[PDB]
């Protein structure tokens, strides 16, 4: 996975954070909402 | 009108298909008879004979005839089953009969079927063909 | 216990239902607790704004994408020889072979290339740059930003509106019809005259020159003295070539009728003066319904006027059951939408308006598709909605002997004759495909039943295909219709004629026997479809198998094993069989248009028209043939770009069978095996410490039919959107 | 092609919308 | 079962059946795809599936023509 | 609950975390023969001489059970009483709430449950809206 | 024997009498008449 | 829990109060009927939904309904 | 399955080294084909009077018969 267009840093740190931080981060969020109370 | 679909006596394709029908019969000659049939047909490029469904009279033995037909020998068994079911509802086991067929009031109604179309226009004008809207049970609405 | 606050009753159950029930429950805004009416409308204005945002944050980053990673400045060079690229591949998985495979028209990077349509689109309406689609891309970000500051903004208590002002259907009826029907398509002329036209001309209409440079070399003082013929004056000439000026001719509003035919799509100068006329008809239609001025109509008075003897109370007391009802309303939104969805999809593939997207099959196969889809869905929804509103919303003492009570009030006979047409349409056309399937097997294909579909091909004739040898209206030029004899104002006619008459635009496509019992399959698939959706909204308030079913409510999932058993009769259900009878129609309806225009592309017509009256026909010539370029994406000896769409095709399939595991399979099994399973935690060594805090269930019996119908449904779309897409890309570039 | 600048530029352009988006749904959630 | 007797079908045509040349070669009569596709399940799809139905799928107009016909009618 | 349980081996059909948690059920049934019932759990015990007490976590796994002492024994056992025994230590009576079964008329009993109307009359949703009510209960 | 004359006339046997006497017919009419698409 | 309601066209047949597992139903005077008699629920926070007493009612179209409702651990049937 | 999604999936993805093949991470049956070598050296020792293999299904020669193979071992 090269990038040839502008900014081919974006998509290496943006797969990650779409692909973990925001599923491990809204499920842990989540998780901890529908089971608060 | 037409021009799309050329009679396959002057069509080059149905020739060519007609050199080699079968036989669908024992008959060795089910094939020649089968392409003189259908040469008087109007068949497009392919070489298969269609059928037109206007009701043109010019083509009124593609569809029409069998029709006809079908809605005679139809109304037949419609009217035949019927006129059976009608019977068997005064016989103080209405239930059991259609187990069991009636067979000469079976046989007796199902050549009753010569005379139908007779016999539903006259229930329809005296009334023994349909039944009234309030008459019949019916779901909640 | 907290997640669900929208309702009291899931938030007691100590079940994983709660978590599956809220998700399912947290639109439905009318079972909410602590709703009134006006918080109800509220609530769902600001949802509409968030959608609106959802709507313009979607194509902000198609253009964002199309303008970053995708080759928006080399296509427009080429757009014959270039492909269209979506946007950038990047997942770490990919080895050295995908990345060499995936690495496509023209790029260095993997690339997914675009079968949206989008490049052809934005070429056709005049953007030629990348800065003009990140303009584009940054604008709507700002605008989505706007629409999400509107709806925060009409949830505060000072800006939330009343119930009189939702309720007020005359001025929204006017504010739609002229100000958003009327005034956008009034601004979309107004940008094909001012940019889409002159830079299909050739010149530079941007931003700057765009107050210098005036459309016309006329003004403005034509368009008020009345000469409108300035206008036009000289048209695009047959020989001009887009993007560039050759023979352009300066004239921003003609009526030439027939297809560019250079780019094979309708004229922009043409389309510009569509959307004038539409413009002007719209704004004049809304000004239709009264308002705080004296002028107009009251709806009221319309519906309440319309009253013969053969109905008796006629529509009177229609405009509070519309009005009152938010599902009446969504669904005759939805109806009209499906329908006009229907006629996008019908209409952009036999009248294309885009640039070379015409030539470019694989945009216009999955345009087409992607659009029939949508307009299924959006008919079921409507049906859906129609059960909805006779379970919920309906009155049957306001709604007393108007149209409503009697639909309701002769349901059976319109059921049977619903169930009459199927049954007869679809035992003759199995009939027939069993009849040539069997009698060509035999060895004798000249023994099929070929029907000419001679209706059709006379509604062509009529509009001025000359192929099939009659001269009717437009097939005949001494005709009335032809000639135009009071005016001969038949301007679009020579173009016309001159583009139905072409064989090479799927304008009006030549239609044979194979067509008609294709026509009557989709008859089929409308009519049972329609059957089971009416069954189910007029069955809504109760048959005789459970003459209550206004109080179990729209989804409940059975009535118990009493009565003779009572599995389906929600009214749910019936939408869940006829989610089922659409996708089967959609199916036969995309399969029939694929394959007649994958013998038109390519030339090889005689292939569908002697292969499709029989079933396998359909099969060893269609979905055999065709699929050869797909499974074979990736093989023992290498992997090329139709490898994610060979991917996807298995994809699709394992999803429409793990449907088939939630439509086949029931409840009970799966609530005892999971019974065992919660022994087996509950019992086992250093998992004892891991306890669940709500306690696992199966899925409920509605649930997991809709389970089941949400995977038929993705693996289904899945799997034709990979084969259809591989099919033509594996041919057609 | 593009530029470096005009993928920031739009990046902290749609954090707007993001902070809007996340203040309209925690409105609607009351 | 239908899983034993395609495993059973697929391996007999690639690994044990076939003509044995008199130079004693064996040819298979899928010639050994059993090893490298029966791995995927697009070499189920494709190399046993699509590409041995094409014998009951071209058999209209010929003696089997009735396993055309009956393969039809199971679907 | 007095009562010596009955004579049974164990099984894994039984009771889970449920029952020292929140309620489960005793089951309290008196016998003079000694015989084999099935355990609705799962299995056969024996029914002790006199007083038997059997803990179950379902009240349909104890009605179960009372249902095939009365119809499956000739010298039929009609005496059992449910209760509702929490971990906190309280135990409730449950099934013959009364002194007689349900089917039989106690006549010192109350109507609850019973609407004034049939189905046919019954209010029809258009009426109750956004009221937080449903049609049965209105 | 009236138990032969009531089993006869039950509704498998009478069906698929009538449904062989139909397809004799049928097949009768193809074995002499063989391929008739139309009139 | 579930509501399970009981109409007016009861004839005190008792078969909806021995058909229930539970034993939510009992049967209580009444003066409408030849039986002198007419199925109450009071129990009702005990029934689990299973419909065996609209099964067992004979009368058309049904005096006993129940109407599901808010789960809990007793209506839901759950040793767990 | 799940080795077979995932060859399927290390197919697609252009990565023929990482799937489960015999040119790849290898998955050899071995008691079955300690089965075979047991059975194809069974007529020698642990069945003395039988002069044939058991069948050839588990070693040996092929069978060879009017030009088409009646049965060779099964690797
Ligand atoms: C809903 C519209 C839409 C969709 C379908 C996608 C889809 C995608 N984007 Mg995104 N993107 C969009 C909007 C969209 N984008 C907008 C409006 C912007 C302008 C700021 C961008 C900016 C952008 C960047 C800078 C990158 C992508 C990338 C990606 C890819 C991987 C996902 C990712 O890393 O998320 C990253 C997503 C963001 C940083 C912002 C997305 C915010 C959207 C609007 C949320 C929409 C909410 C939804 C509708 C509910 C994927 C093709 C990556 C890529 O191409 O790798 C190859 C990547 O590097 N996107
Ligand atoms: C959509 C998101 C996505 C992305 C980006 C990835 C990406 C990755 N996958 Mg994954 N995968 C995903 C979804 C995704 N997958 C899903 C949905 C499936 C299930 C079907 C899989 C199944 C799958 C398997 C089974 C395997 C991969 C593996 C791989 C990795 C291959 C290279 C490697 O060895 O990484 C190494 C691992 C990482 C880079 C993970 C990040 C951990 C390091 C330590 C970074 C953390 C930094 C620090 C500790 C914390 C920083 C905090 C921060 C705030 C600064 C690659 C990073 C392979 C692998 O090696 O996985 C480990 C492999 O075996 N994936
Ligand atoms: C002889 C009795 C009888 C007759 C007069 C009718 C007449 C009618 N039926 Mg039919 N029907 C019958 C038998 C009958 N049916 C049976 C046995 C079935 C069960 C499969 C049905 C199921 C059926 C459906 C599901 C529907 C109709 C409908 C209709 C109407 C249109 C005609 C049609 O669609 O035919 C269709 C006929 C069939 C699909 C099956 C016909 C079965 C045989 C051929 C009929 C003869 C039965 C029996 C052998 C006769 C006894 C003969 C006697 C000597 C003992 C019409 C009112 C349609 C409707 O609603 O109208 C608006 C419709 O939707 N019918
Ligand atoms: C002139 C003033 C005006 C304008 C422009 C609008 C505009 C709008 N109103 Mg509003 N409204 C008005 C006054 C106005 N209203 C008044 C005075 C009332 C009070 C009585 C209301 C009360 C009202 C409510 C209660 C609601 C709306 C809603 C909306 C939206 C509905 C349109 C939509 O989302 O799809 C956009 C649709 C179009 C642009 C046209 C439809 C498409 C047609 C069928 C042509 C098809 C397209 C064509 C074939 C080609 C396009 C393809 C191309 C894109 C590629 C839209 C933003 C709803 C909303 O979204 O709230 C936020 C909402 O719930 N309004
Ligand atoms: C204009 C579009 C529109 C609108 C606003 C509504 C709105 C409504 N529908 Mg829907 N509906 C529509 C289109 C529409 N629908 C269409 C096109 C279909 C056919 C597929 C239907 C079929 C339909 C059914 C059969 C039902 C409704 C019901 C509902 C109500 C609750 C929504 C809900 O439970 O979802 C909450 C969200 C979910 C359940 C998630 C599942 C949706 C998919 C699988 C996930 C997609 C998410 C993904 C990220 C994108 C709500 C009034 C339900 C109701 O109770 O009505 C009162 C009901 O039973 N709808
Ligand atoms: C090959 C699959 C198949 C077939 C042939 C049928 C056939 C039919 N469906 Mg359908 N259906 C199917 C799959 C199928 N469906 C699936 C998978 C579902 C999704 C759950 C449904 C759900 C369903 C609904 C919910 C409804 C039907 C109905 C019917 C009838 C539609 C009328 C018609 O087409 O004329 C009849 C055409 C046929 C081809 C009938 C097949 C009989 C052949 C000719 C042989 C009969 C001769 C002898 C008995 C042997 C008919 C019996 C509708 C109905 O009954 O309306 C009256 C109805 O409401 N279907
Ligand atoms: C329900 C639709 C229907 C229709 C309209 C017909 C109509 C016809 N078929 Mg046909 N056919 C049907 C379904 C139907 N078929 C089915 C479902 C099959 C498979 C069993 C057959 C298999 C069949 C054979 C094999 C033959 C006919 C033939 C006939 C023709 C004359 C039959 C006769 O006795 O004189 C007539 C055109 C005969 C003929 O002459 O065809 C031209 C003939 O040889 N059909
Ligand atoms: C051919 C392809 C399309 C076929 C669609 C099939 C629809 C089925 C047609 C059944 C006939 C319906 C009986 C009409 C029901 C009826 O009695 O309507 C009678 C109606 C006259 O009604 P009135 O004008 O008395 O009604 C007062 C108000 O209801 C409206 O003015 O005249 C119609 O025939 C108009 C209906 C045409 C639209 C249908
Ligand atoms: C809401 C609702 C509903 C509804 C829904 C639905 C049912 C829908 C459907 C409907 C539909 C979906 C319809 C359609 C329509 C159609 C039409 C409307 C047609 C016609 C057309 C026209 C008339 C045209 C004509 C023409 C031609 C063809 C050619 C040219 C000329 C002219 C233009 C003349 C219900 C009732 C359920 C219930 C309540 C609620
Ligand atoms: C001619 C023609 C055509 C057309 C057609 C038409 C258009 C028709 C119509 C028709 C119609 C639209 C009809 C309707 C009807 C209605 C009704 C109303 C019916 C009646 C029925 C009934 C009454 C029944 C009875 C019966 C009988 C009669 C017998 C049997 C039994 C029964 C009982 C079933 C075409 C082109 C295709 C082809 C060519 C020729
Ligand atoms: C498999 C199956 C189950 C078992 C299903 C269970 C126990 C839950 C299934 C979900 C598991 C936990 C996997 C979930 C993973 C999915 C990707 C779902 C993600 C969660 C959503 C929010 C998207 C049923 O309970 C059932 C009930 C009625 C009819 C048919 C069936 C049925 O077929
Ligand atoms: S099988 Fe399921 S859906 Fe059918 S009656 Fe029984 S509980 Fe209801
Ligand atoms: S079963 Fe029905 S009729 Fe009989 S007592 Fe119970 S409610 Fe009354």
Not at chain 1, 3 to 15: E, K, N, T
Not at chain 3, 208 to 218: C, W
Not at chain 3, 264 to 278: F, K, M, P, Q, R
Not at chain 3, 467 to 477: C, K, Q, R, T
Request: hydrophobic share 45%; proline share 5%; aromatic share 14%.
């Amino acid at each position: 996975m090269d990038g040839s267009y502008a900014a081919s840093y974006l998509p290496w740190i943006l797969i990650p954070m779409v692909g973990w931080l925001f599923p491990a981060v809204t499920m842990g969020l989540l998780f901890i909402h529908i089971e608060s109370e | 009108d037409f021009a799309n679909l050329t009679p396959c006596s002057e069509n080059p394709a149905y020739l060519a298909k007609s050199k080699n029908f079968l036989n669908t019969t024992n008959d060795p000659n089910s094939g020649k008879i089968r392409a003189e049939r259908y040469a008087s047909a109007l068949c497009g490029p392919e070489g298969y004979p269609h059928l037109i469904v206007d009701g043109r009279f010019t083509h009124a033995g593609d569809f029409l005839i069998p029709s006809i037909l079908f809605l005679y020998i139809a109304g037949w068994i419609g009217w035949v089953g019927r006129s059976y079911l009608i019977e068997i509802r005064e016989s103080k086991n209405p239930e059991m009969q259609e187990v069991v067929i009636n067979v000469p009031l079976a046989i007796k109604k199902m050549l009753g079927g010569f005379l139908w179309p007779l016999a539903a226009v006259g229930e329809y004008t005296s009334g023994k063909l349909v039944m009234k809207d309030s008459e019949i049970p019916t779901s909640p609405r | 216990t907290k997640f669900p606050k929208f309702s009291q009753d899931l938030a007691q159950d100590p079940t994983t239902r709660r978590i599956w029930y809220g998700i399912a429950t947290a639109h439905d805004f009318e079972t909410h607790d602590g709703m009134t009416e006006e918080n109800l409308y509220q609530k769902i204005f600001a949802s509409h704004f968030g959608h609106i945002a959802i709507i313009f944050l979607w194509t902000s980053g198609t253009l964002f994408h199309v303008a970053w990673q995708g080759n928006f400045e080399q296509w427009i060079k080429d757009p014959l020889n270039i492909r269209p690229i979506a946007h950038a591949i990047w997942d770490p998985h990919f080895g050295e072979g995908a990345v060499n495979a995936f690495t496509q028209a023209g790029a260095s990077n993997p690339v997914n290339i675009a079968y949206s349509g989008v490049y052809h689109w934005f070429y056709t309406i005049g953007m030629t740059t990348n800065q003009e689609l990140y303009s584009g891309a940054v604008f709507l970000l700002v605008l989505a930003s706007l629409f999400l500051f509107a709806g925060w903004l009409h949830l505060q208590p000072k800006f939330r509106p009343s119930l009189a002002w939702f309720k007020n259907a005359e001025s929204r009826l006017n504010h739609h019809l002229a100000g958003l029907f009327g005034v956008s398509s009034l601004a979309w002329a107004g940008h094909l005259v001012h940019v889409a036209i002159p830079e299909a001309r050739g010149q530079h209409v941007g931003w700057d020159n765009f107050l210098s440079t005036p459309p016309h070399p006329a003004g403005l003082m034509p368009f008020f003295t009345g000469n409108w013929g300035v206008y036009a004056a000289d048209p695009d000439t047959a020989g001009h070539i887009f993007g560039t000026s050759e023979g352009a001719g300066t004239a921003i509003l003609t009526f030439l009728g027939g297809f560019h035919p250079q780019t094979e799509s309708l004229w922009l100068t043409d389309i510009a003066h569509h959307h004038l006329a539409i413009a002007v008809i719209f704004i004049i239609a809304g000004h239709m319904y009264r308002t705080n001025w004296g002028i107009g109509h009251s709806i009221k008075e319309i519906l309440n006027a319309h009253k013969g003897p053969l109905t008796g109370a006629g529509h009177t007391n229609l405009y509070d059951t519309i009005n009152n009802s938010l599902h009446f309303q969504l669904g005759l939104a939805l109806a009209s939408l499906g329908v006009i969805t229907s006629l996008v999809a019908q209409h952009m593939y036999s009248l294309p308006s885009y640039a070379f997207i015409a030539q470019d099959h694989t945009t216009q196969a999955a345009l087409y598709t992607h659009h029939q889809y949508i307009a299924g869905f959006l008919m079921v929804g409507a049906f859906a909605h129609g059960a909805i509103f006779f379970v919920r919303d309906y009155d049957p003492v306001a709604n007393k002997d108007n149209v409503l009570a009697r639909m309701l009030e002769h349901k059976e006979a319109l059921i049977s004759h619903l169930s009459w047409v199927s049954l007869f349409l679809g035992f003759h056309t199995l009939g027939l495909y069993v009849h040539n399937d069997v009698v060509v097997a035999f060895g004798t294909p000249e023994k099929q039943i070929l029907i000419e579909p001679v209706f059709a091909q006379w509604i062509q004739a009529t509009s001025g295909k000359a192929l099939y040898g009659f001269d009717v209206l437009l097939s005949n030029p001494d005709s009335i219709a032809s000639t135009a004899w009071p005016n001969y104002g038949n301007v679009w006619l020579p173009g016309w004629l001159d583009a139905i008459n072409s064989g090479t635009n799927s304008l009006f496509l030549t239609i044979g026997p194979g067509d008609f019992l294709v026509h009557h399959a989709i008859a089929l698939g409308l009519h049972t479809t329609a059957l089971i959706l009416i069954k189910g909204a007029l069955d809504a308030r109760g048959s005789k198998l459970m003459p209550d079913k206004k109080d179990f409510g729209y989804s409940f999932p059975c009535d118990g094993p009493g009565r003779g058993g009572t599995c389906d009769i929600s009214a749910w259900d019936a939408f869940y069989l006829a989610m089922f009878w659409m996708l089967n129609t959609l199916g036969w309806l995309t399969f029939y248009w694929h394959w007649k225009h994958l013998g038109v592309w390519s030339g090889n017509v005689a292939q569908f028209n002697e292969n499709s009256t029989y079933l396998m026909g359909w099969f060893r010539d269609y979905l055999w043939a065709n699929s050869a370029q797909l499974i074979n994406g990736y093989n023992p000896y290498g992997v090329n770009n139709l490898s994610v769409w060979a991917w996807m095709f298995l994809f699709g399939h394992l999803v429409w069978a793990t449907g088939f595991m939630f439509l086949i399979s029931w409840r009970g099994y799966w609530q005892e095996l999971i019974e065992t399973i919660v022994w087996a935690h509950e019992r086992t060594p250093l998992a004892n410490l891991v306890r669940w805090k709500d306690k696992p269930v199966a899925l409920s019996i509605v649930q997991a039919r809709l389970v089941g119908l949400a995977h038929f449904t993705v693996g289904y779309v899945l799997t034709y959107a990979a084969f259809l897409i591989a099919s033509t890309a594996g041919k057609f570039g | 092609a593009l530029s470096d600048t005009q993928i920031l530029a739009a990046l902290v352009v749609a954090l707007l919308p993001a902070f809007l988006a996340f203040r309209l749904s925690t409105e609607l959630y009351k | 079962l239908s899983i034993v007797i395609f495993h059973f079908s697929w391996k007999m045509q690639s690994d044990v059946w076939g003509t044995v040349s008199p130079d004693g070669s064996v040819t298979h009569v899928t010639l050994g795809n059993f090893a490298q596709s029966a791995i995927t399940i697009n070499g189920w799809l494709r190399d046993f599936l699509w590409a041995q139905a094409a014998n009951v799928i071209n058999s209209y107009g010929s003696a089997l023509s009735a396993y055309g016909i009956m393969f039809l009618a199971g679907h | 609950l007095s009562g010596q349980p009955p004579k049974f081996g164990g099984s894994t059909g039984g009771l889970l975390s449920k029952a020292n948690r929140e309620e489960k059920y005793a089951i309290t049934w008196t016998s003079a023969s000694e015989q084999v019932f099935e355990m609705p759990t799962g299995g056969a015990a024996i029914m002790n001489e006199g007083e038997n007490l059997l803990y179950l976590a379902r009240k349909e796994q104890c009605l179960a059970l009372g249902t095939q002492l009365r119809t499956k024994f000739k010298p039929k056992i009609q005496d059992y009483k449910i209760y509702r025994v929490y971990p906190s230590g309280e135990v409730q009576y449950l099934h013959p709430a009364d002194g007689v079964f349900p089917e039989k008329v106690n006549e010192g009993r109350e109507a609850q449950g019973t609407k004034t109307r049939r189905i046919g009359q019954n209010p029809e949703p258009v009426t109750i809206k956004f009221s937080g009510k449903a049609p049965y209960e209105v | 024997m009236d138990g032969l004359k009531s089993f006869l006339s039950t509704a498998p046997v009478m069906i698929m009498a009538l449904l062989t006497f139909t397809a004799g017919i049928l097949i009768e009419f193809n074995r002499f008449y063989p391929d008739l698409l139309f009139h | 829990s579930h509501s399970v309601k009981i109409y007016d066209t009861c004839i005190g047949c008792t078969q909806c109060v021995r058909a229930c597992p539970l034993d939510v139903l009992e049967m209580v005077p009444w003066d409408g009927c030849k039986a002198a008699q007419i199925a109450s629920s009071p129990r009702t926070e005990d029934c689990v939904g299973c419909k065996r007493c609209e099964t067992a009612c004979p009368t058309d179209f049904l005096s006993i309904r129940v109407y599901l409702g808010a789960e809990t651990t007793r209506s839901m049937g759950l040793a767990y | 399955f799940g080795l077979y999604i995932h060859n399927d999936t290390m197919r697609a993805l252009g990565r023929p080294q990482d799937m489960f093949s015999d040119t790849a991470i290898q998955l050899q049956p071995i008691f079955a084909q300690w089965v075979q070598h047991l059975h194809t050296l069974a007529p020698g020792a642990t069945a003395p009077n039988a002069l044939a293999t058991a069948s050839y299904a588990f070693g040996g020669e092929t069978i060879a018969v009017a030009g088409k193979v009646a049965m060779m071992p099964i690797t």
